[PDB]
Amino acid sequence: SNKLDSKVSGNYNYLYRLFRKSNLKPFERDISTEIYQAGNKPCNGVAG
């Protein structure tokens, strides 16, 4: 698929996940994660 999908401009609509606490089951898919303020930081939006 380097000659079909990857092309002159590239189809950048292929997203992938990196962080979840509930991992995948056999034949199961998470369609939308719920990312909230998991950290208990006092200053919201800290650097680093």
Partner: protein
């Protein structure tokens, strides 16, 4: 991977409250359709 459904109806003749009908009755499979669904809780529809 999917949802299995078993059901059978019973003509009850015994008292309805404070009682479950004593006896044996196996439930035959009725429908089983391929839906890959994650299920944690459920709720009835009255």
């Amino acid at each position: 991977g999917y949802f299995k459904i078993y059901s059978k109806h019973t003509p009850i003749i015994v008292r309805e409250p404070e009682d479950l009908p004593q006896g044996f009755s196996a439930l035959e499979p009725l429908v089983d359709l391929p839906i890959g669904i994650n299920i944690t809780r459920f709720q009835t529809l009255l």
